[PDB]
Design a protein around this nucleic acid. Structure first.
Ligand SMILES: [Mg+2]
Ligand SMILES: [Mg+2]
Ligand SMILES: [Mg+2]
Ligand SMILES: [Mg+2]
Ligand SMILES: [Mg+2]
Ligand SMILES: [Mg+2]
Ligand SMILES: [Mg+2]
Ligand SMILES: [Mg+2]
Ligand SMILES: [Mg+2]
Ligand SMILES: [Mg+2]
Ligand SMILES: [Mg+2]
Ligand SMILES: [Mg+2]
Lengths: 149, 64, 226
RNA sequence: AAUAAAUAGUCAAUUAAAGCAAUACGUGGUGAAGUGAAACAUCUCAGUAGCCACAGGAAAAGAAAACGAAUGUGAUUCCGU
RNA sequence: AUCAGGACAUUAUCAUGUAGAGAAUAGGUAGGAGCAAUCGAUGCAAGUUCGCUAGGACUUGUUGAUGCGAAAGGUGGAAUACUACCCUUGGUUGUGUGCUGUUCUAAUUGGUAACUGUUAUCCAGUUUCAAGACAGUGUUAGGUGGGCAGUUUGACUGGGG
RNA sequence: GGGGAUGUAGCUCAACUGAUAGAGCACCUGAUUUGCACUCAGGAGGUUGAGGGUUUGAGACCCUUCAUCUCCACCA
């Protein structure tokens, strides 16, 4: 019968998941380890409600994350040919605020907490790695243009 | 005795029919088995219940 | 698996191997799956629950189709009444002389019809004609005193049926250009005749599978297959 | 108390139960054998005797997931056929 | 509960094949003689499939079209292509079952020890140890079972046996 | 009362699941020793349990029987 596990186990389910196993293995040996409650509040429908809502907020997060990531993978129209000296110093040290002055409005919003670039924000006369992550799972790479104005 | 403690259903006396339909009195005993029923997280008595009552408790989430 | 030809992938893509295709629909589909430039045959394979090792379960006979199968048959008549056989529409007539021609290797005919008197001469040729299937059989009404009427019946589209060693009957119902109703009526007449020809010894399901196919087509598992 | 809590346990107060008989009726559990079948094992005796539990002034049963074959009757109980 | 193994039908996986005859690998038996080619040949070298010990294809290429004589000759019980279908067999995991084989434990068990109720060999609770899905118990079904029970074991007969 | 299987040299057995019956033993002969036995090899010993049915092809596949066996059943 269907049983919900509240934390993660190696097989079956990962944290909040549902597995349809026989009465079998634990039951009175599952309750003590309370690793898989029969349902949430033991109610088939109530567990439905709870797990559904939780993973639903989770996948609406999934949706906004995908939006950000793909609008980036498809557009990435963030251009900065910032004047570069050459022999004298020249780099992408334009932090990111000037760089985000081209993200919202002209392109995807590209939330502030979503571009997890490091403290360098580019430091060469050449394009470097731009790290933007919509969530902790989606990995976004941006390599925008650079040059001398 | 061979009886439930939650309900009172007990043994059934009957006939032992064989070839030639010879009659000998026999007794069917209930499948008495030991179980522990929690009650408000306490008094986990080791009661002796039948398998049918065990199934009823199991489908009732151990409620009695 | 051998790579299917380009045309057949299309033709196989038109056929659900799992669906139970109703007769009429199968015939209309069978006509559509003909990929050939020549006028193919429409053929039926009926798998029976027969042990053809059992003489009582050996199914052999003839069926007269309501409609012509559209294959011209050259008939050799071996009879004393050569004139009436010719008027019946035999393509070749003769007595012992044609038996000698057959002995010398002349085989430009598709069916032999004969009178009972000639089996002793033809029996000596059983190795040549029997391996080719040209040997007349009483069970097929190819051995008869009225050779002209039988000749007319075969020209009208009478065909022999025989169970193979596996208990299958294979017959050609018509051409691809033949009207679909004619093929359906021909198929029904065969199936009803087969049903009517049940050996008393065959227990259970008699027809295991019915398959319609063309000369160059996939088999379109007739309704209620396998 | 084991053992923090809590139960088990201990104590106190209040309320009921015990038993009897009517050599008779009710319900339930358990339940033979003599005997007959001209033997006997199926069967009968007989769910009788006996044993036990619970009553009551009666008890039990009781308002159709029914009878049953029809333009049908419409809780249970008891008598005749 | 987990792990491993085969066993099973077998998911999924391709090879593999000669009565003779007929150059023919003919595994068979159906419709009936074609049908593929830069998705690329033929001839050869390098591997391998394989016993009919012949033959079979393939890939490792060259190569660039042939055809192809199993398209079309050919004999053969059986025949030619190609649509077939079934394949012979094994090939690997395999599917979901049971089958013996381990490990772990919470079920459960204890006539191990300890504490408590408790001034108490029982019982109950909590442990600890030892087992352990075994055992025990319930239902069902075989085997043995004068230990026990209910009965039978004829009539004629110069008495009966 | 069915269900299955078996029947092949005299004996013990392969069965040559149709493209035309073989092995050990029994027996004859030959070699073989001073003798016996042993030893080796040829030959002989087959109408495939019987009958019927099919095809071009069956002891071999099918039907019918015969004998044998193992199972079950086996309350007139
Ligand atoms: Mg009795
Ligand atoms: Mg009696
Ligand atoms: Mg009596
Ligand atoms: Mg009352
Ligand atoms: Mg004791
Ligand atoms: Mg057990
Ligand atoms: Mg028993
Ligand atoms: Mg006895
Ligand atoms: Mg006795
Ligand atoms: Mg008696
Ligand atoms: Mg007497
Ligand atoms: Mg006397």
């Amino acid at each position: 019968m269907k049983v919900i596990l509240k934390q993660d186990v190696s097989n079956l389910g990962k944290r909040f998941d549902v597995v349809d196993v026989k009465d079998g293995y634990a039951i009175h040996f599952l309750f003590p380890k309370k690793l898989a409650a029969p349902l949430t509040k033991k109610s088939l429908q109530d567990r439905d409600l709870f797990l559904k809502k939780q993973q639903e907020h989770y996948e609406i997060n999934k949706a906004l994350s995908h939006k950000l990531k793909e609008v980036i993978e498809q557009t990435e129209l963030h251009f900065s040919l910032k004047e570069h000296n050459g022999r004298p110093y020249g780099s992408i040290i334009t932090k990111q605020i000037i760089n985000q002055a081209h993200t919202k409005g002209m392109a995807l919003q590209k939330f502030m907490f979503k571009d997890n670039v490091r403290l360098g924000f580019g430091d060469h006369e050449i394009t470097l790695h731009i790290f933007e992550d919509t969530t902790a799972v989606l990995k976004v790479k941006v390599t925008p243009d650079n040059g001398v104005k | 005795a061979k009886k439930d403690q939650l309900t009172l259903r007990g043994p059934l006396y009957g006939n032992n029919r064989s070839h030639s339909k010879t009659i000998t009195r026999r007794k069917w005993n209930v499948n008495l088995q030991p179980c522990k029923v929690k009650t408000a997280d306490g008094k986990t008595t080791r009661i002796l219940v039948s398998t049918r009552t065990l199934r009823t408790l199991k489908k009732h989430n151990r409620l009695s | 698996m051998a790579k299917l030809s380009k045309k057949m992938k299309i033709a196989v893509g038109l056929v659900d191997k799992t669906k139970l295709y109703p007769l009429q629909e199968a015939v209309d589909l069978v006509k559509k799956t003909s990929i050939t430039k020549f006028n193919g045959s429409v053929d039926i394979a009926v798998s029976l629950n027969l042990d053809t090792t059992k003489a009582e379960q050996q199914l052999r006979g003839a069926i007269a189709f309501p409609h012509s199968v559209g294959k011209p048959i050259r008939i050799l008549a071996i009879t004393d009444d050569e004139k009436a056989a010719l008027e019946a529409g035999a393509d070749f007539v003769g007595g012992i002389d044609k038996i000698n021609d057959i002995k010398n290797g002349w085989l430009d005919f598709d069916l032999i019809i004969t009178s009972p008197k000639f089996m002793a001469a033809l029996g000596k040729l059983g190795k040549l004609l029997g391996t080719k299937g040209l040997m007349p059989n009483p069970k097929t009404e190819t051995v008869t005193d009225d050779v002209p009427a039988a000749v007319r019946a075969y020209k009208k589209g009478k065909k022999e049926y025989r169970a193979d060693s596996f208990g299958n009957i294979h017959m050609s119902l018509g051409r691809v250009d033949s009207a679909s109703n004619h093929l359906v009526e021909n198929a029904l007449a065969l199936l009803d005749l087969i049903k009517s020809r049940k050996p008393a010894t065959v227990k259970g399901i008699y027809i295991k599978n019915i398959a319609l196919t063309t000369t160059m087509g996939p088999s379109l598992k007739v309704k209620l297959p396998d």
